[PDB]
Design a protein around this ligand. Structure first.
Ligand SMILES: Nc1nc2c(ncn2[C@@H]2O[C@H](COP(=O)(O)OP(=O)(O)OP(=O)(O)O)[C@@H](O)[C@H]2O)c(=O)[nH]1
Ligand SMILES: Nc1ncnc2c1ncn2[C@@H]1O[C@H](COP(=O)(O)OP(=O)(O)CP(=O)(O)O)[C@@H](O)[C@H]1O
Ligand SMILES: Nc1nc2c(ncn2[C@@H]2O[C@H](COP(=O)(O)OP(=O)(O)O)[C@@H](O)[C@H]2O)c(=O)[nH]1
Ligand SMILES: [Ca+2]
Ligand SMILES: [Ca+2]
Ligand SMILES: [Ca+2]
Ligand SMILES: [Mg+2]
Ligand SMILES: [Mg+2]
Ligand SMILES: [Mg+2]
Lengths: 352, 438, 422, 54
C-alpha cells in the first residue's frame, strides 16, 4: 500500500492522477501535512524540497525537479541560453531575446538597442514583443521607445525578443497558431515526449500591419475565447490535433508533421533538458523527482521551429487528460512504486 | 606551539571522543600506556602533536581532554577501556543521574550544581598550557547533557577564556538511531544559547553516517561503534592540521578566518571520501580526481542536502596520502566544468588546499579499508540551511500543541525561552536565504 | 546504580506482584532462595535495579508487601518464591478494607501507612541513586485502591522529585468481586492523574477475553489472568533490567502532557496449547499491534497514538524489525498523531522470556484509553445518581461532595483525551 | 586558475587556488539566570507540598 499527499488542489493534471491512483486500490491518500508519504504532488511555489528523503524506510518521490524554474521562467530561460555553452548565444531555434529590468530597480538594455538600431538601419523587419512572467500584459510594437516605456510603467523583470513576422498560416483562414508539446521526465531522467500535441490556433486572419489588436497575434486559448469573434469556427475550441495538422501539411505543403516540425521539436526538447541535467538530476539524491513540462513552439513560413517558452505546471487538452495522466502513472509513478502497449510516449535517448 | 583542550559532553561526545583519541594515538605512534617511542624529548617538547598531548616525566603522553557526563556508565568505559592508562581520574567527570533528554534539566537543574567543578578541572589543564588556543567541544544536539549542559559550559568558557576560540563537533539528531522524541526541542534550545559563543561548528547528521555505513561499509544495522569510528576519521581529517607540521589551519583562529566570513553562519559542510569496506576482496585505489569529484556527491556529505542549490562562502580541501598539487588542480579544473559551484559575489571563488602525506590511519579490526589517499572537503554552503529547516519544522509541529513543554517548565525553564530560541532560528534561516538566493 | 523500589498493595496487587518477581527472578537466574545460578553475565549487569545484594552473594528483591489483612501475604510467604522476600518488608493489618476505598484511604489504611513508609524509607536509604517507585495494585478493591493511592500521595510528599509508576488493574463488571468497584476505581483514577508519572492500565475484561477467545481457556481464573500480567510486566521492564533507559527518560519521551500518562500494554505471542511453532517477525508485529493482544480493552482504531514504545526480545533480525515496524506505521498512519514526529520507538533485547524464542511487548499512550474511563464513569453515575451503596462510604467519614468531584475529575480527563483525538 | 602561497615541508604542503576574484553575558548575569530557574523550581515544589498539606 503506497501513500501520497496532495499539496496543489488547482492542478487539473495531478487531480486526475490522484483520482487514478485511488482507483487502483493500492494507493492511499494522506493529509497534506503528513510526512509519511511515498509520493508528493507538491505545490507550485516554494516546494519544501529540503524536507524530502529524511523519513526512515520511505522511498519518496515528488512531481517537480528542484531547479527546473531556470527553464520555465522568462528571464531565467534567456539567461540560461545566452550563458550555457551547450546552447550558446548563437542558438538557432530561439528568438533573439534580451533581459530588461524596469528603470525603477544583469540588464541588457543597451545591448538590445544596439541590435535594434542595426535592424532599423538595414531596412529589416524590426518588430519585437515584450512580456513577463507576472502577466495574465503583453505589448507588440515596432518602436523601441514604446517597448521600453511599457516596461518602466511596470515593476517586474521583462524580456524583449524578436517577433516572428513570417509565421506559418493555416488555410483557409490565413491565421497564426502555436504548438504545445507535453514532455515527461522521470526519476531516471528519461525524456518522454507525449505522442499527442495540440495546435492552439488563432481564429482571426493574421494582420501584419496592425499589432494593436492582439487577437490574431496571440494564440493563447484564453485570449481567443475572450477577445476573438471566430472562436470554434475552423476547429473545436481552436484546438487542432496532430492527426488533422499532419493531414493538412500533406495536402498543402506536401510533407509530414514528423519531417518538417517534429524532428526540430524533439531536438529542442533534448537540448534544453540535457543542458540542465547536471543541475537538477536526482540520480544520486536522497529523494527522486519527475516533472511534466509544456513546451510551446512557433513555426515560420520556412517550416523552421522556434521555441517560445517552457511551462513547469502545464495544463492539458481536455481530450488528452485520460491518456496522458494514465501515462504519468505508468512511467513516472508505478516505475518507482510498482503495482500488483505500445507506449503513448516517444523516448528521446541521450547521453547522461 | 599552542595547546588545544578537548571537551566531551554527554554520551555522544564521550563515546566519539573515545574513538578520536584512539585514532590520534595510532596516528602519532602512542601506545595504550601513553609511551611514545618516537618522541626523543622525554618529558617535554613543543612539537605539533604536543598541542593535543602533554607529557609526564615518565614519558607518558596524556591527552589534553576532559570528559563530562551526568551519569557514569558511558565514562566508566574509558576508565576500564584499552586506553584507560592515558587519562587520570581528574579528567573524567561523572554525575549520578542524567538529564533525561531534558535540556532544562541539563542546563539549569543539574548544570548549576556541577558547572563550577567542570571549569575547575578545565582550569587545571589550562594551567599546563603555555599559550592555549581554545577548545574543541564534542556533544550531541538531542541529549539533555549534550545540549543543555554544553550551552552552559560554552557561556562560562566565553567568560573565563574571552580571547580563546571554541569549535564544536555536534551530532545532529536522526530518528533511525534515536529513541527520544524531544530532540528537536533540545537541538534548537542549545543552538540558540550557543550561537554567540561558538566560532565554528561541524554538524554531523547521524542519518548521513548511518547511510554511509550501510552503503559503503555494507553494515546492515550500524552500531554506535561503527558510526563513531567513521566519525572520528572525519574529525581526524579536520584536526590533523593542528597536530602535524603544516601551513594551513595551523591554529584554531584560522578555522574562522578560512570558513566563516559571517559569524552566525559558522556551520561548514563536511564531505569525506573514500569510505571503503575492509571486508571487500580488494578495491581499486581511487585517483585524486575521483576522490575530489566525490566531495560534490551528496552521498558522502556529513549532512544530507543539495549544495547545487546554495552558494559557497568558503572551501578547503584537506588531503591525506599520495597527493601532489598538480593532480589536485587538474581535478579541480575538471569539476568546475561539470559541477554547479556558485559562490557568493562578495567572496572569492577559490580553494585553500592542504596535503598531508601520511595516509589515513585505520583502526585494526575496524570497518574501514586502508586507502592510499583520502580527502575531506570543508565548504560553507547555504545548502546546509536545509538541515535547520527540517529541524525547525519538527519543532513547530510539537510546540504548536505545547507537547512535552511541561517537562522543561518543571525544571525551572520559562516557556518564553522556547519561542525566544525558535525566533533566533527563524532569523538564522533568513540569514542563510539572504546570503544564498536571489 | 539506578535502583527501583517495588510496592505491592492488596489482594490483587500482591498476587500479581508475587508472580512478577517469580518471572523475572527466573530471567535473572535467582532461585527461590535468592542464590544466583544463571549462565550469562547479562543477567547480573542490571540486577541491582530490582534486587539488593545481601551477605553470601544473596539477591533479595527490593519489594514491600502491603495489605490490610494477612490472608493473601501468608499465601505469598508460602508461595513458590515466598522465601525470597525480606521478612521485614511484610507490612499488614488485621481489619481488612471491605472492598471500601474509604477504609483503605482514610480509616483502616491511615492507621497502617506510617509503618509502610518506614520500610520504604529504609529501602531508599540503601539505594545508591533511587530511580523511583513502582506500585502494583487494583483499583476496584479497598486496600490496593484506597491505601495504594494514599501511599502514593505520601511517597510523593517525601520524594517529590522521584518517578512514581504503577501497574493498575481496572475493574470490569464481567470479572467483578463487588458492585462498588466503579466507586473505588473512579476515586483512585483522580489520585493517579495527579500523583503518578506513568500508569499501565490493565483491564480485567481484556485479560478475560484474551484467556477465553485467544488462549482458549474455557473457565479462566485469576491465576490465568495473572499469567498474562506477569508476562507483560516482564516485557515492559526489559528496558530497565538489561543493557540498552531509566524511568525519567521513558516518561519524558512517552508523556507529552502531564495528565495523559495512562498507557495500554500489549504482549505477543499469545498462543493456545501449535505452541512449538516458530514465530516470525511480521507475525510478532501483526499481533502486537492487534487489539486482541492489548490489555486495556480499548480499540486503538477508535483514537490515536500519542507515543508508542515497542520492545522485541530474542535473537532476531534487527534490520527485519525496523522493516516491519515502519511497515505498521506507514500502513496505518491515520492512527498516529502527526504533530509528534517519530513518535514510534523500537528497542531490541537479546534475552527472550522463558519458553519463547522471541517475543514483543507493546507500550502505547493512546487517546483510545478514554473508552476505559468512559465505561467506569457510566457505571459510576448509574449508581451515584441513586446514591446506591454510598452508606458504606459515608459511614467512614466521606461526604457526597467528594464523589461529585471525583465524577467531574473523571469526565474532565475524558474530555481532555477527546480534544487531542481530533 | 592561479596557485598562491605554496608552502612545503617534510610532512606535506599547502597552497591556495583562486579561480575568480570577488565582485556576552557576564558571570553575574549567568548566575542570575541559573538562580532564577532554581527559584521557579522552588516555588513549584512549594505549591505541590502546599497542595499535599491540604
Ligand atoms: N554518532 C553518535 N551519536 C550518538 C552516540 N550516542 C548517542 N548519540 C545520539 O545522541 C542523541 C542522544 O543524546 P545523548 O548524547 O545520548 O544524551 P546525553 O548527552 O548523554 O544527555 P542525557 O539525556 O543526560 O543522557 C541521539 O540522537 C543519539 O542518536 C554515539 O555514540 N555516536
Ligand atoms: N517572438 C514571438 N513571435 C511571434 N509570436 C509570439 C512571440 N512570442 C510570443 N508569441 C505569441 O504569444 C503566444 C504565447 O505567449 P506566451 O506563451 O509568451 O504567454 P504565456 O506564457 O502566458 C501563454 P502559455 O505559457 O500558456 O503558452 C503565442 O500564441 C505566440 O503566437
Ligand atoms: N487480574 C487480577 N485481578 C484481581 C485479582 N484479585 C482481585 N482482582 C480484581 O481486583 C478488584 C478487587 O480488589 P482486591 O485486590 O481484591 O481488593 P484489596 O485486597 O482490598 O486491594 C476486583 O476488580 C477484582 O476483579 C487477581 O489476582 N488478578
Ligand atoms: Ca616530546
Ligand atoms: Ca565569544
Ligand atoms: Ca482500628
Ligand atoms: Mg506561461
Ligand atoms: Mg546520557
Ligand atoms: Mg479481594
Amino acid at each position: 500500500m503506497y501513500t501520497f499527499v496532495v499539496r496543489d488542489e488547482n492542478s487539473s493534471v495531478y487531480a486526475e492522477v490522484s483520482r487514478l491512483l485511488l482507483a487502483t486500490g493500492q494507493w492511499k491518500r494522506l493529509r497534506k501535512d503528513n510526512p509519511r508519504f511515498n509520493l508528493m504532488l507538491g505545490e507550485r511555489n516554494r516546494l519544501p524540497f529540503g524536507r524530502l528523503g529524511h523519513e526512515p524506510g520511505l522511498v519518496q518521490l515528488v512531481n517537480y525537479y528542484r531547479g527546473a524554474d531556470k527553464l520555465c521562467r522568462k528571464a531565467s530561460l534567456v539567461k540560461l541560453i545566452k550563458t550555457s555553452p551547450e546552447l550558446s548565444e548563437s542558438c538557432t531555434w530561439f528568438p533573439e531575446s534580451y533581459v530588461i529590468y524596469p528603470t525603477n530597480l544583469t540588464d541588457e538594455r543597451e545591448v538590445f538597442l544596439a541590435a535594434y538600431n542595426r535592424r532599423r538601419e538595414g531596412r529589416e523587419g524590426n518588430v519585437w514583443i515584450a512580456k513577463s512572467s507576472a502577466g495574465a500584459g503583453i505589448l507588440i510594437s515596432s518602436e523601441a521607445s514604446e517597448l521600453l516605456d511599457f516596461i518602466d510603467e511596470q515593476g517586474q523583470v521583462h524580456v524583449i525578443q524578436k517577433y516572428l513576422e513570417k509565421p506559418l498560416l493555416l488555410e483557409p483562414g490565413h491565421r497564426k497558431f502555436d504548438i504545445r508539446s507535453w514532455v515527461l521526465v522521470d526519476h531516471l531522467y528519461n525524456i518522454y515526449l507525449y505522442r499527442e500535441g495540440v495546435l492552439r490556433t488563432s481564429s482571426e486572419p493574421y494582420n501584419s500591419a496592425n499589432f494593436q489588436d492582439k487577437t490574431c497575434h496571440l494564440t493563447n486559448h484564453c485570449i481567443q475565447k475572450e477577445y476573438s469573434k471566430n472562436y470554434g469556427r475552423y476547429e473545436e475550441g481552436n484546438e487542432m490535433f496532430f492527426e488533422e495538422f499532419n493531414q493538412y501539411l500533406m495536402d498543402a505543403l506536401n510533407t509530414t508533421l514528423e519531417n518538417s516540425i517534429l524532428l526540430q521539436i524533439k531536438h529542442i526538447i533534448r537540448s534544453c533538458l540535457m543542458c540542465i541535467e547536471p543541475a537538477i538530476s536526482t540520480k544520486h539524491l536522497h529523494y527522486q523527482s519527475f516533472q511534466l513540462f509544456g513546451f510551446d513552439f512557433m513555426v515560420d513560413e520556412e517550416l523552421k521551429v522556434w521555441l517560445i517558452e517552457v511551462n513547469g505546471a502545464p495544463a492539458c487538452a481536455q481530450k488528452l487528460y485520460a491518456e496522458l495522466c494514465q501515462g504519468i502513472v505508468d512511467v513516472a509513478i508505478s516505475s518507482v512504486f510498482p503495482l500488483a502497449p505500445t507506449s503513448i510516449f516517444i523516448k528521446l535517448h541521450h547521453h547522461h | 606551539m599552542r595547546e588545544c583542550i578537548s571537551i566531551h559532553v554527554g554520551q555522544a561526545g564521550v563515546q566519539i571522543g573515545n574513538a578520536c583519541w584512539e585514532l590520534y594515538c595510532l596516528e602519532h605512534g602512542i601506545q595504550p600506556d601513553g609511551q611514545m617511542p618516537s618522541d626523543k624529548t622525554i618529558g617535554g617538547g613543543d612539537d605539533s602533536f604536543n598541542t593535543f598531548f602533554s607529557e609526564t616525566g615518565a614519558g607518558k603522553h596524556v591527552p589534553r581532554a576532559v570528559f563530562v557526563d551526568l551519569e557514569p556508565t558511558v565514562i566508566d568505559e574509558v576508565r576500564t577501556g584499552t586506553y584507560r592508562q592515558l587519562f587520570h581520574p581528574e579528567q573524567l567527570i561523572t554525575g549520578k543521574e542524567d538529564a533525561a533528554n531534558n535540556y532544562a534539566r541539563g542546563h539549569y537543574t543539574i548544570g548549576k550544581e556541577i558547572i563550577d567543578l567542570v571549569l575547575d578541572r578545565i582550569r587545571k589543564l589550562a594551567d599546563q598550557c603555555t599559550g592555549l588556543q581554545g577548545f574543541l567541544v564534542f556533544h550531541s544536539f538531542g541529549g539533555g547533557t549534550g545540549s543543555g549542559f554544553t550551552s552552559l559550559l560554552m557561556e562560562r568558557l566565553s567568560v573565563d577564556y574571552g580571547k580563546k576560540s571554541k569549535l564544536e563537533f555536534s551530532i545532529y539528531p536522526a530518528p533511525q538511531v534515536s529513541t527520544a522524541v524531544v530532540e528537536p526541542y533540545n537541538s534548537i534550545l542549545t543552538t540558540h544559547t550557543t550561537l554567540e559563543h561558538s566560532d565554528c561548528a561541524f554538524m554531523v547528521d547521524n542519518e548521513a553516517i548511518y547511510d554511509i555505513c550501510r552503503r559503503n561499509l555494507d553494515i546492515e544495522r550500524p552500531t554506535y561503534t561503527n558510526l563513531n569510528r567513521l566519525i572520528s576519521q572525519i574529525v581526524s581529517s579536520i584536526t590533523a592540521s593542528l597536530r602535524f607540521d603544516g601551513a594551513l589551519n595551523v591554529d584554531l583562529t584560522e578555522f574562522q578566518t578560512n570558513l566563516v566570513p559571517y559569524p552566525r553562519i559558522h556551520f561548514p559542510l563536511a564531505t569525506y571520501a573514500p569510505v571503503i569496506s575492509a571486508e571487500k576482496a580488494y578495491h581499486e585505489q581511487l585517483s585524486v580526481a575521483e576522490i575530489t569529484n566525490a566531495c560534490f556527491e551528496p552521498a558522502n556529505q556529513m549532512v544530507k542536502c543539495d549544495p547545487r542549490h546554495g552558494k559557497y562562502m568558503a572551501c578547503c580541501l584537506l588531503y591525506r596520502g599520495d597527493v601532489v598539487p598538480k593532480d589536485v588542480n587538474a581535478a579541480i579544473a575538471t569539476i568546475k566544468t561539470k559541477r554547479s559551484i556558485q559562490f557568493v559575489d562578495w567572496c572569492p571563488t577559490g580553494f585553500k588546499v592542504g596535503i598531508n602525506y601520511q595516509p589515513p590511519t585505520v583502526v585494526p579490526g575496524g570497518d574501514l579499508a586502508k586507502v592510499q589517499r583520502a580527502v575531506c572537503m570543508l565548504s560553507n554552503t547555504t545548502a546546509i540551511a536545509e538541515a535547520w529547516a527540517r529541524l525547525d519544522h519538527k519543532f513547530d509541529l510539537m510546540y504548536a500543541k505545547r507537547a512535552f513543554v511541561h517537562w522543561y517548565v518543571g525544571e525551572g525553564m520559562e516557556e518564553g525561552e522556547f519561542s525566544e530560541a525558535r525566533e533566533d532560528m527563524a532569523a538564522l534561516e533568513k540569514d542563510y536565504e539572504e546570503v544564498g538566493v536571489d | 546504580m539506578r535502583e527501583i523500589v517495588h510496592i505491592q498493595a492488596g489482594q490483587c496487587g500482591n498476587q500479581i506482584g508475587a508472580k512478577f518477581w517469580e518471572v523475572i527472578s527466573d530471567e535473572h537466574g535467582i532461585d527461590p532462595t535468592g542464590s544466583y545460578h544463571g549462565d550469562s553475565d547479562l543477567q547480573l549487569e542490571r540486577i541491582n535495579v530490582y534486587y539488593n545484594e545481601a551477605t553470601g552473594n544473596k539477591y533479595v528483591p527490593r519489594a514491600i508487601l502491603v495489605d490490610l489483612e494477612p490472608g493473601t501475604m501468608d499465601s505469598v510467604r508460602s508461595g513458590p518464591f515466598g522465601q525470597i522476600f525480606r521478612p521485614d518488608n511484610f507490612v499488614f493489618g488485621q481489619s481488612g478494607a471491605g472492598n471500601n476505598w474509604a477504609k483503605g484511604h482514610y480509616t483502616e489504611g491511615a492507621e497502617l501507612v506510617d509503618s509502610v513508609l518506614d520500610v520504604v524509607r529504609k529501602e531508599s536509604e540503601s539505594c545508591d541513586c533511587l530511580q523511583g517507585f513502582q506500585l502494583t495494585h487494583s483499583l476496584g478493591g479497598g486496600t490496593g485502591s484506597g491505601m495504594g493511592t494514599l501511599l502514593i500521595s505520601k511517597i510523593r510528599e517525601e520524594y517529590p522529585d522521584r518517578i512514581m509508576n504503577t501497574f493498575s488493574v481496572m475493574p470490569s463488571p464481567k470479572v467483578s468481586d463487588t458492585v462498588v468497584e466503579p466507586y473505588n476505581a473512579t476515586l483512585s483514577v483522580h489520585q493517579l492523574v495527579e500523583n503518578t508519572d506513568e500508569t499501565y492500565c490493565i483491564d480485567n475484561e481484556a485479560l478475560y477475553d484474551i484467556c477465553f477467545r485467544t488462549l482458549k481457556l474455557t473457565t479462566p481464573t485469576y491465576g490465568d489472568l495473572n499469567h498474562l500480567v506477569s508476562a507483560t510486566m516482564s516485557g515492559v521492564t526489559t528496558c530497565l533490567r538489561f543493557p540498552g533507559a531509566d524511568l525519567r527518560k521513558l516518561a519524558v519521551n512517552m508523556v507529552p502532557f502531564p495528565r495523559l500518562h495512562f498507557f495500554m500494554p500489549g504482549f505477543a505471542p499469545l498462543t493456545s496449547r501449535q505452541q512449538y511453532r516458530a514465530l516470525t517477525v511480521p507475525e510478532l508485529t501483526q499481533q502486537m499491534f492487534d487489539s486482541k493482544n492489548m490489555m486495556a480493552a480499548c480499540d486503538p482504531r477508535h483514537g490515536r497514538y500519542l507515543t508508542v514504545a515497542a520492545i522485541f526480545r530474542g535473537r532476531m533480525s534487527m534490520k527485519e524489525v525496523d522493516e516491519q515496524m515502519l511497515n505498521v506505521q506507514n500502513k496505518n498512519s491515520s492512527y498516529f498523531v502527526e504533530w509528534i514526529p517519530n513518535n514510534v520507538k523500537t528497542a531490541v533485547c537479546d534475552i527472550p522470556p522463558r519458553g519463547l524464542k522471541m517475543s514483543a511487548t507493546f507500550i502505547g499512550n493512546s487517546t483510545a484509553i478514554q473508552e476505559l474511563f468512559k465505561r467506569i464513569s457510566e457505571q459510576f453515575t448509574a449508581m451515584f445518581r441513586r446514591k446506591a451503596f454510598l452508606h458504606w462510604y459515608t459511614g467512614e467519614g466521606m461526604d457526597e461532595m467528594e464523589f461529585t468531584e471525583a465524577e467531574s475529575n473523571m469526565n474532565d480527563l475524558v474530555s481532555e483525551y477527546q480534544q487531542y483525538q481530533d | 586558475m592561479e596557485v598562491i602561497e605554496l608552502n612545503k615541508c617534510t610532512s606535506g604542503q599547502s597552497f591556495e587556488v583562486i579561480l575568480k576574484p570577488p565582485s556576552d553575558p557576564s558571570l553575574e548575569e549567568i548566575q542570575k539566570k541559573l538562580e532564577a530557574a532554581e527559584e521557579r523550581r522552588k516555588y513549584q515544589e512549594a505549591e505541590l507540598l502546599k497542595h499535599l498539606a491540604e
